[PDB]
């Protein structure tokens, strides 16, 4: 069975997620509205930007992340943000529609919408497959929130200097995730492995997004539509 320290971690992560993710999607009305060249870029850039603030909120509540150096916290967040957003979005993804349904119809985004934000199927095809494989795992809340913390606390990111300390952290989280599935997930005999695979998938998705964002931000008529926080986090500044 599980120890008090491990379920203490689980308690923190779940609450962290509950503060930083608002099932009412009511804040969305304050983004630049969706429009349907590059008509969806302003609403979606405002969407991502808001999500980055949520992830930073979540990150700060991961036990230990706070006690990292500020460079390391930056490096983790800069390289992992697009991955955590892609993860957390799975909560708003529907297999019926194959789209992210955030409350109202104007906050329902399909693949076609995201192409109107300057993105190709070379990214959207694997992303939505990823969302489908991820939804089929039927993750518990605990499992979903652990994987975001494991993804964010990867020491194999560009920029990280305290590689030891972050692998220590990430390790303790996998022990929890492995022991949670074993003891709290019936039929989870293979679930940890396929959660690890979903991480490898996120590295590919990151890569493809990184490529497609570079072209997006090398055209000022499009990068002017992004937000300062998006440009800072996806910026290549060191």
């Amino acid at each position: 069975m599980l120890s008090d320290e491990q379920m203490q971690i689980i308690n923190s992560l779940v609450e962290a997620h509950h503060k930083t993710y608002d099932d009412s999607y009511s804040d969305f009305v304050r983004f630049r509205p969706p429009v349907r060249r590059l008509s969806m870029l302003p609403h979606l850039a405002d969407l991502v930007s808001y999500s980055i603030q949520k992830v930073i909120g979540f990150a700060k509540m991961i036990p230990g992340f706070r006690d990292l150096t500020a460079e390391d916290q930056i490096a983790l967040l800069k390289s992992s943000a697009i991955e955590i957003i892609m993860l957390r979005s799975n909560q708003s993804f529907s297999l019926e529609d194959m789209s992210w349904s955030c409350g109202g119809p104007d906050f329902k985004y399909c693949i076609n919408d995201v192409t109107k934000a300057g993105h190709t199927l070379e990214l959207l095809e694997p992303l939505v497959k990823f969302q489908v494989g991820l939804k089929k795992l039927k993750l518990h809340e605990e499992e979903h929130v652990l994987l975001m913390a494991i993804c964010l606390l990867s020491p194999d990111r560009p920029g990280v200097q305290d590689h030891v300390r972050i692998e220590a952290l990430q390790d303790r989280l996998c022990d929890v995730l492995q022991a949670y599935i074993r003891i709290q997930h019936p039929g989870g005999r293979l679930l940890y492995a396929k959660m690890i695979q979903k991480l490898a998938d996120l590295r590919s998705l990151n890569e493809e997004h990184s490529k497609q964002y570079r072209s997006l931000s090398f055209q000022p008529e499009h990068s002017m539509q992004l937000t300062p926080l998006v440009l800072e986090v996806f910026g290549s500044e060191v």
């Binding site: 603030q53 930073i56 930056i74 967040l77 300062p228 926080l229 800072e232 500044e237």
Partner: peptide, 10 residues
């Protein structure tokens, strides 16, 4: 640099 990130990280 990373002016906003430093801020958001208290």
């Amino acid at each position: 640099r990373h002016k906003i990130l430093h801020r958001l990280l208290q």
